[PDB]
Every structure is written in C-alpha cells, then in structure tokens.
Short mmCIF file of all heavy atoms in Angstrom, two decimals:
data_model
loop_
_atom_site.label_atom_id
_atom_site.label_comp_id
_atom_site.label_asym_id
_atom_site.label_seq_id
_atom_site.Cartn_x
_atom_site.Cartn_y
_atom_site.Cartn_z
N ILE K 1 -66.85 22.57 -54.86
CA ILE K 1 -67.91 22.39 -53.83
C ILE K 1 -68.58 23.71 -53.72
O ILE K 1 -68.11 24.85 -53.76
CB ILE K 1 -67.25 22.00 -52.50
CG1 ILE K 1 -66.48 20.73 -52.71
CG2 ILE K 1 -68.20 21.86 -51.44
CD1 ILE K 1 -67.29 19.51 -53.10
N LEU K 2 -69.91 23.58 -53.59
CA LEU K 2 -70.80 24.84 -53.51
C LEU K 2 -70.80 25.48 -52.15
O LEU K 2 -70.18 24.88 -51.20
CB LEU K 2 -72.26 24.47 -53.78
CG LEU K 2 -72.54 23.74 -55.08
CD1 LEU K 2 -74.04 23.44 -55.26
CD2 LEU K 2 -72.11 24.60 -56.28
N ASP K 3 -71.18 26.64 -52.02
CA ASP K 3 -71.07 27.42 -50.76
C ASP K 3 -72.41 27.25 -49.95
O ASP K 3 -73.48 27.00 -50.41
CB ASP K 3 -70.87 28.83 -50.99
CG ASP K 3 -70.46 29.62 -49.88
OD1 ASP K 3 -69.24 29.58 -49.40
OD2 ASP K 3 -71.43 30.33 -49.22
N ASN K 4 -72.19 27.36 -48.64
CA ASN K 4 -73.32 27.18 -47.75
C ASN K 4 -74.23 28.32 -47.57
O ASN K 4 -75.32 28.18 -47.00
CB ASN K 4 -72.77 26.78 -46.30
CG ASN K 4 -71.84 25.62 -46.32
OD1 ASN K 4 -70.74 25.78 -45.90
ND2 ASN K 4 -72.31 24.55 -46.76
N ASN K 5 -73.85 29.52 -48.10
CA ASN K 5 -74.56 30.72 -47.70
C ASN K 5 -75.14 31.48 -48.89
O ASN K 5 -75.79 32.49 -48.64
CB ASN K 5 -73.61 31.57 -46.94
CG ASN K 5 -73.24 30.97 -45.58
OD1 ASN K 5 -74.13 30.53 -44.86
ND2 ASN K 5 -72.00 31.13 -45.17
N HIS K 6 -75.07 30.97 -50.06
CA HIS K 6 -75.69 31.75 -51.19
C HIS K 6 -77.20 31.38 -51.15
O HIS K 6 -77.50 30.22 -51.24
CB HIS K 6 -74.98 31.35 -52.45
CG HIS K 6 -73.74 31.97 -52.64
ND1 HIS K 6 -73.46 33.42 -52.81
CD2 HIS K 6 -72.40 31.46 -52.59
CE1 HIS K 6 -72.24 33.61 -52.93
NE2 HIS K 6 -71.52 32.48 -52.80
N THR K 7 -78.03 32.41 -51.07
CA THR K 7 -79.40 32.24 -50.99
C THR K 7 -80.12 31.78 -52.33
O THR K 7 -81.25 31.38 -52.30
CB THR K 7 -80.07 33.45 -50.41
OG1 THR K 7 -81.49 33.13 -50.22
CG2 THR K 7 -80.07 34.53 -51.41
N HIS K 8 -79.40 31.86 -53.42
CA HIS K 8 -79.82 31.22 -54.65
C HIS K 8 -78.76 30.69 -55.43
O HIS K 8 -77.69 31.26 -55.50
CB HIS K 8 -80.62 32.22 -55.51
CG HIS K 8 -81.92 32.75 -54.91
ND1 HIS K 8 -83.12 31.98 -54.91
CD2 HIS K 8 -82.22 33.84 -54.14
CE1 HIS K 8 -84.01 32.63 -54.16
NE2 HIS K 8 -83.49 33.73 -53.77
N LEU K 9 -78.91 29.49 -56.07
CA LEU K 9 -77.89 28.85 -56.90
C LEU K 9 -78.53 28.56 -58.24
O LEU K 9 -79.68 28.04 -58.32
CB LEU K 9 -77.35 27.63 -56.21
CG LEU K 9 -76.58 27.88 -54.94
CD1 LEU K 9 -76.19 26.54 -54.32
CD2 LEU K 9 -75.30 28.64 -55.25
N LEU K 10 -77.75 28.84 -59.22
CA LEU K 10 -78.24 28.52 -60.68
C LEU K 10 -77.11 27.83 -61.35
O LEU K 10 -75.97 28.21 -61.26
CB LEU K 10 -78.52 29.78 -61.40
CG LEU K 10 -79.65 30.63 -60.85
CD1 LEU K 10 -79.78 31.93 -61.61
CD2 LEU K 10 -80.89 29.96 -60.67
N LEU K 11 -77.37 26.60 -62.01
CA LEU K 11 -76.34 25.80 -62.49
C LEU K 11 -76.65 25.55 -63.98
O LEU K 11 -77.75 25.04 -64.26
CB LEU K 11 -76.31 24.45 -61.71
CG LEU K 11 -75.58 24.46 -60.39
CD1 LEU K 11 -76.42 25.08 -59.27
CD2 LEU K 11 -75.09 23.19 -59.95
N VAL K 12 -75.72 25.84 -64.77
CA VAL K 12 -75.88 25.70 -66.26
C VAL K 12 -75.61 24.18 -66.63
O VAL K 12 -74.95 23.52 -66.03
CB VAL K 12 -74.98 26.60 -67.03
CG1 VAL K 12 -75.18 28.00 -66.61
CG2 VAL K 12 -73.60 26.23 -67.00
N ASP K 13 -76.25 23.77 -67.79
CA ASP K 13 -76.26 22.40 -68.17
C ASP K 13 -75.39 22.24 -69.41
O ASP K 13 -75.55 23.02 -70.40
CB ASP K 13 -77.60 21.74 -68.46
CG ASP K 13 -77.57 20.25 -68.45
OD1 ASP K 13 -76.49 19.62 -68.15
OD2 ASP K 13 -78.70 19.68 -68.53
N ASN K 14 -74.50 21.30 -69.46
CA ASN K 14 -73.56 21.01 -70.58
C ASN K 14 -73.32 19.55 -70.59
O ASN K 14 -74.15 18.74 -70.14
CB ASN K 14 -72.25 21.84 -70.25
CG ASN K 14 -71.45 22.02 -71.56
OD1 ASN K 14 -71.91 21.69 -72.67
ND2 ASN K 14 -70.25 22.58 -71.39
N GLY K 15 -72.22 19.05 -71.30
CA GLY K 15 -71.90 17.76 -71.32
C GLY K 15 -70.95 17.36 -70.21
O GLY K 15 -71.35 17.22 -69.00
N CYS K 16 -69.65 17.14 -70.53
CA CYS K 16 -68.79 16.31 -69.62
C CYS K 16 -68.31 17.17 -68.45
O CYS K 16 -68.56 18.32 -68.26
CB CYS K 16 -67.64 15.75 -70.49
SG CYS K 16 -68.13 14.52 -71.68
N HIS K 17 -67.38 16.53 -67.60
CA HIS K 17 -66.91 17.15 -66.48
C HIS K 17 -65.76 18.14 -66.82
O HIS K 17 -65.61 19.18 -66.21
CB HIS K 17 -66.38 16.07 -65.53
CG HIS K 17 -67.35 15.19 -64.93
ND1 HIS K 17 -68.07 14.27 -65.65
CD2 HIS K 17 -67.81 15.09 -63.59
CE1 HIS K 17 -68.97 13.66 -64.80
NE2 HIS K 17 -68.84 14.14 -63.60
N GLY K 18 -65.00 17.85 -67.81
CA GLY K 18 -63.87 18.67 -68.21
C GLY K 18 -64.32 19.88 -69.07
O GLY K 18 -63.99 19.98 -70.16
N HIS K 19 -65.12 20.77 -68.44
CA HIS K 19 -65.66 21.90 -69.11
C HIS K 19 -65.77 23.03 -68.01
O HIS K 19 -66.75 23.18 -67.41
CB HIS K 19 -66.97 21.67 -69.78
CG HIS K 19 -67.01 20.69 -70.85
ND1 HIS K 19 -66.41 20.93 -72.12
CD2 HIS K 19 -67.47 19.40 -70.96
CE1 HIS K 19 -66.47 19.94 -72.78
NE2 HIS K 19 -67.14 18.96 -72.18
N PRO K 20 -64.71 23.75 -67.84
CA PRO K 20 -64.78 25.04 -66.98
C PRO K 20 -65.48 26.11 -67.95
O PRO K 20 -65.62 25.93 -69.10
CB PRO K 20 -63.35 25.38 -66.63
CG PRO K 20 -62.60 24.22 -66.97
CD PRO K 20 -63.29 23.55 -68.12
N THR K 21 -65.81 27.23 -67.31
CA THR K 21 -66.20 28.46 -67.99
C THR K 21 -67.45 28.33 -68.92
O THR K 21 -67.41 28.86 -70.01
CB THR K 21 -64.98 29.11 -68.71
OG1 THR K 21 -64.69 28.31 -69.92
CG2 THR K 21 -63.76 29.24 -67.83
N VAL K 22 -68.34 27.49 -68.48
CA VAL K 22 -69.52 27.25 -69.28
C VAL K 22 -70.66 28.24 -68.95
O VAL K 22 -71.31 28.64 -69.90
CB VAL K 22 -69.90 25.77 -69.05
CG1 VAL K 22 -71.17 25.41 -69.82
CG2 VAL K 22 -68.83 24.87 -69.25
N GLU K 23 -70.74 28.64 -67.73
CA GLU K 23 -71.79 29.44 -67.31
C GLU K 23 -71.63 30.89 -67.61
O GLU K 23 -72.59 31.70 -67.46
CB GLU K 23 -71.86 29.38 -65.74
CG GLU K 23 -70.68 30.18 -65.06
CD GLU K 23 -69.49 29.36 -64.89
OE1 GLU K 23 -69.38 28.23 -65.51
OE2 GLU K 23 -68.56 29.69 -64.11
N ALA K 24 -70.58 31.32 -68.22
CA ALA K 24 -70.30 32.66 -68.66
C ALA K 24 -71.27 33.17 -69.73
O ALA K 24 -71.66 34.36 -69.64
CB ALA K 24 -68.88 32.82 -69.22
N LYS K 25 -71.83 32.33 -70.59
CA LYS K 25 -72.69 32.82 -71.58
C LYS K 25 -74.06 33.11 -71.02
O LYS K 25 -74.59 34.16 -71.30
CB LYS K 25 -72.78 31.74 -72.71
CG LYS K 25 -71.45 31.50 -73.47
CD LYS K 25 -71.53 30.40 -74.43
CE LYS K 25 -70.16 30.24 -75.05
NZ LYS K 25 -70.25 29.11 -76.09
N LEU K 26 -74.56 32.22 -70.23
CA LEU K 26 -75.92 32.52 -69.53
C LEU K 26 -75.78 33.62 -68.57
O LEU K 26 -76.73 34.41 -68.49
CB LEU K 26 -76.35 31.27 -68.77
CG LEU K 26 -77.77 31.39 -68.14
CD1 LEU K 26 -78.79 31.50 -69.25
CD2 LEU K 26 -78.09 30.34 -67.10
N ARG K 27 -74.63 33.76 -67.82
CA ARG K 27 -74.40 34.85 -66.97
C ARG K 27 -74.41 36.15 -67.61
O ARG K 27 -75.21 37.05 -67.24
CB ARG K 27 -73.10 34.62 -66.13
CG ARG K 27 -72.91 35.68 -65.09
CD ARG K 27 -71.67 35.32 -64.29
NE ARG K 27 -71.48 36.28 -63.21
CZ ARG K 27 -70.47 36.11 -62.36
NH1 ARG K 27 -69.69 35.09 -62.41
NH2 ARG K 27 -70.29 36.96 -61.39
N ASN K 28 -73.65 36.28 -68.68
CA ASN K 28 -73.49 37.60 -69.34
C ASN K 28 -74.79 37.89 -70.17
O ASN K 28 -75.15 39.05 -70.33
CB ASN K 28 -72.32 37.57 -70.37
CG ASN K 28 -71.04 37.46 -69.65
OD1 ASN K 28 -70.86 38.15 -68.64
ND2 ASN K 28 -70.12 36.70 -70.18
N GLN K 29 -75.55 36.88 -70.54
CA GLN K 29 -76.79 37.18 -71.16
C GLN K 29 -77.86 37.70 -70.15
O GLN K 29 -78.64 38.53 -70.46
CB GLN K 29 -77.34 35.89 -71.92
CG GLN K 29 -78.70 36.06 -72.61
CD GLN K 29 -79.17 34.85 -73.37
OE1 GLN K 29 -78.37 33.88 -73.42
NE2 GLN K 29 -80.34 34.88 -73.92
N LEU K 30 -77.76 37.14 -68.85
CA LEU K 30 -78.66 37.75 -67.84
C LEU K 30 -78.23 39.07 -67.56
O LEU K 30 -79.06 40.00 -67.23
CB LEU K 30 -78.58 36.85 -66.65
CG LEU K 30 -79.56 37.13 -65.58
CD1 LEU K 30 -80.94 36.96 -66.06
CD2 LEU K 30 -79.39 36.30 -64.35
N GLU K 31 -76.96 39.43 -67.46
CA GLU K 31 -76.37 40.77 -67.38
C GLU K 31 -76.96 41.69 -68.35
O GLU K 31 -77.48 42.81 -68.00
CB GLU K 31 -74.89 40.88 -67.35
CG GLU K 31 -74.24 39.96 -66.30
CD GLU K 31 -72.76 40.00 -66.48
OE1 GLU K 31 -72.22 40.62 -67.41
OE2 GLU K 31 -72.07 39.48 -65.58
N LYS K 32 -76.87 41.31 -69.71
CA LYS K 32 -77.35 42.17 -70.71
C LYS K 32 -78.81 42.36 -70.67
O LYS K 32 -79.38 43.48 -70.90
CB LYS K 32 -76.95 41.61 -72.04
CG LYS K 32 -77.24 42.35 -73.25
CD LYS K 32 -76.64 41.69 -74.47
CE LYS K 32 -76.93 42.49 -75.78
NZ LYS K 32 -76.37 41.77 -76.93
N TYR K 33 -79.58 41.37 -70.18
CA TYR K 33 -81.05 41.51 -70.09
C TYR K 33 -81.51 42.34 -69.08
O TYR K 33 -82.42 43.19 -69.25
CB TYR K 33 -81.70 40.06 -70.00
CG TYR K 33 -83.17 40.27 -69.88
CD1 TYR K 33 -83.96 40.62 -71.00
CD2 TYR K 33 -83.85 40.03 -68.73
CE1 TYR K 33 -85.26 40.80 -70.92
CE2 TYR K 33 -85.17 40.18 -68.59
CZ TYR K 33 -85.93 40.54 -69.71
OH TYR K 33 -87.33 40.72 -69.71
N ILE K 34 -80.86 42.33 -67.79
CA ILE K 34 -81.27 43.34 -66.85
C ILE K 34 -80.73 44.66 -67.27
O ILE K 34 -81.51 45.68 -67.04
CB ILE K 34 -80.81 42.89 -65.45
CG1 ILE K 34 -81.75 41.86 -64.86
CG2 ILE K 34 -80.69 44.05 -64.48
CD1 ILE K 34 -81.49 40.48 -65.07
N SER K 35 -79.68 44.77 -67.93
CA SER K 35 -79.10 46.04 -68.37
C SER K 35 -79.96 46.72 -69.45
O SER K 35 -79.81 47.89 -69.70
CB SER K 35 -77.70 45.80 -69.04
OG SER K 35 -77.21 46.97 -69.63
N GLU K 36 -80.85 45.95 -70.16
CA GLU K 36 -81.77 46.53 -70.96
C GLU K 36 -83.22 46.53 -70.40
O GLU K 36 -84.15 47.26 -70.86
CB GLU K 36 -81.83 45.89 -72.28
CG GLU K 36 -82.30 44.39 -72.24
CD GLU K 36 -82.23 43.65 -73.54
OE1 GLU K 36 -81.78 44.28 -74.54
OE2 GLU K 36 -82.63 42.48 -73.56
N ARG K 37 -83.43 45.92 -69.24
CA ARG K 37 -84.78 45.76 -68.56
C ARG K 37 -85.05 47.13 -67.90
O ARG K 37 -84.23 47.72 -67.25
CB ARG K 37 -84.69 44.66 -67.58
CG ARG K 37 -86.04 44.40 -66.77
CD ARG K 37 -87.13 43.99 -67.68
NE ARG K 37 -88.24 43.56 -66.83
CZ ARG K 37 -89.16 44.46 -66.33
NH1 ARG K 37 -89.11 45.73 -66.69
NH2 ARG K 37 -90.19 43.97 -65.52
N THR K 38 -86.35 47.42 -68.13
CA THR K 38 -86.76 48.86 -67.68
C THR K 38 -87.69 48.80 -66.38
O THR K 38 -88.64 48.06 -66.42
CB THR K 38 -87.48 49.47 -68.72
OG1 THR K 38 -86.74 49.55 -69.99
CG2 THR K 38 -87.91 50.94 -68.43
N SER K 39 -87.27 49.51 -65.42
CA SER K 39 -88.09 49.58 -64.19
C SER K 39 -88.05 51.02 -63.66
O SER K 39 -87.04 51.46 -63.06
CB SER K 39 -87.53 48.60 -63.13
OG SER K 39 -88.26 48.73 -61.91
N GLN K 40 -89.15 51.74 -63.88
CA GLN K 40 -89.18 53.15 -63.72
C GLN K 40 -89.20 53.66 -62.28
O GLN K 40 -89.24 54.91 -62.20
CB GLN K 40 -90.39 53.76 -64.56
CG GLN K 40 -90.26 53.49 -66.01
CD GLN K 40 -91.52 53.95 -66.86
OE1 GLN K 40 -92.51 54.44 -66.30
NE2 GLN K 40 -91.38 53.94 -68.13
N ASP K 41 -89.29 52.78 -61.30
CA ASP K 41 -89.19 53.22 -59.90
C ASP K 41 -87.71 53.19 -59.48
O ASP K 41 -87.22 52.44 -58.62
CB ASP K 41 -90.03 52.26 -59.09
CG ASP K 41 -91.48 52.53 -59.19
OD1 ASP K 41 -91.84 53.70 -59.65
OD2 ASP K 41 -92.30 51.60 -58.99
N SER K 42 -86.89 54.11 -60.10
CA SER K 42 -85.60 54.26 -59.90
C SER K 42 -85.15 55.64 -60.19
O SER K 42 -85.95 56.52 -60.59
CB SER K 42 -84.71 53.21 -60.66
OG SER K 42 -83.34 53.54 -60.48
N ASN K 43 -83.80 55.95 -59.98
CA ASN K 43 -83.30 57.30 -60.23
C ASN K 43 -82.34 57.26 -61.44
O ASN K 43 -81.76 58.34 -61.78
CB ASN K 43 -82.51 57.73 -59.00
CG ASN K 43 -83.46 57.91 -57.77
OD1 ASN K 43 -83.42 57.14 -56.81
ND2 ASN K 43 -84.34 58.87 -57.77
N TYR K 44 -82.17 56.16 -62.13
CA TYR K 44 -81.29 55.89 -63.17
C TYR K 44 -81.95 56.23 -64.53
O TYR K 44 -81.32 55.91 -65.56
CB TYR K 44 -80.67 54.55 -63.10
CG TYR K 44 -79.42 54.29 -63.88
CD1 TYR K 44 -78.16 54.86 -63.49
CD2 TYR K 44 -79.37 53.46 -65.01
CE1 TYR K 44 -77.03 54.52 -64.21
CE2 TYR K 44 -78.32 53.23 -65.70
CZ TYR K 44 -77.15 53.74 -65.33
OH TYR K 44 -75.97 53.46 -66.02
N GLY K 45 -83.06 56.65 -64.52
CA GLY K 45 -83.91 56.70 -65.76
C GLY K 45 -84.51 55.40 -65.98
O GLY K 45 -84.49 54.93 -67.14
N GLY K 46 -84.92 54.68 -64.95
CA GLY K 46 -85.24 53.34 -65.01
C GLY K 46 -84.01 52.38 -65.16
O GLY K 46 -82.98 52.65 -64.53
N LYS K 47 -84.16 51.46 -65.95
CA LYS K 47 -83.06 50.63 -66.62
C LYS K 47 -82.11 49.92 -65.64
O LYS K 47 -81.21 49.22 -66.19
CB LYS K 47 -82.28 51.66 -67.56
CG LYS K 47 -83.10 52.27 -68.53
CD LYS K 47 -83.62 51.22 -69.56
CE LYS K 47 -84.49 51.86 -70.58
NZ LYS K 47 -85.11 50.89 -71.52
#
C-alpha cells in the first residue's frame, strides 16, 4: 500500500505481480545521473 504523505510517487513498469526489487535499476540510474549532473550554484564544485 502506498503512503499518504509522499509528495511525489514514481512507479516502474514490469510484467507480473511476483516481482519485487524492480525499481532498483531506475532508482540507481537516477542516482548516478544526478551524481554526474552539474549545477554550479553550490559549494560542492557543482555536481
């Protein structure tokens, strides 16, 4: 069951119901993309 208070929800698409741990690939790819994404209004040297 989803939560009432998360202001954004993102749901990955797959096949059947018996599939846990599917969202990990999209999640870790989004992590890696922000981890390489450059935004120079920061103190971290961008990034």
Side-chain angles (χ1 to χ4, degrees):
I1 302 301
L2 303 180
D3 191 80
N4 304 121
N5 291 319
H6 287 291
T7 184
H8 294 280
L9 294 174
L10 300 177
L11 283 81
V12 304
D13 199 1
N14 200 3
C16 292
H17 292 73
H19 295 287
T21 70
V22 179
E23 72 274 15
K25 296 178 184 178
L26 184 67
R27 185 175 182 176
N28 293 318
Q29 183 175 355
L30 189 63
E31 300 178 355
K32 186 175 179 181
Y33 178 69
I34 277 92
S35 173
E36 65 186 1
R37 178 67 172 85
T38 302
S39 178
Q40 292 178 357
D41 289 334
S42 176
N43 297 111
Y44 196 73
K47 301 296 180 185

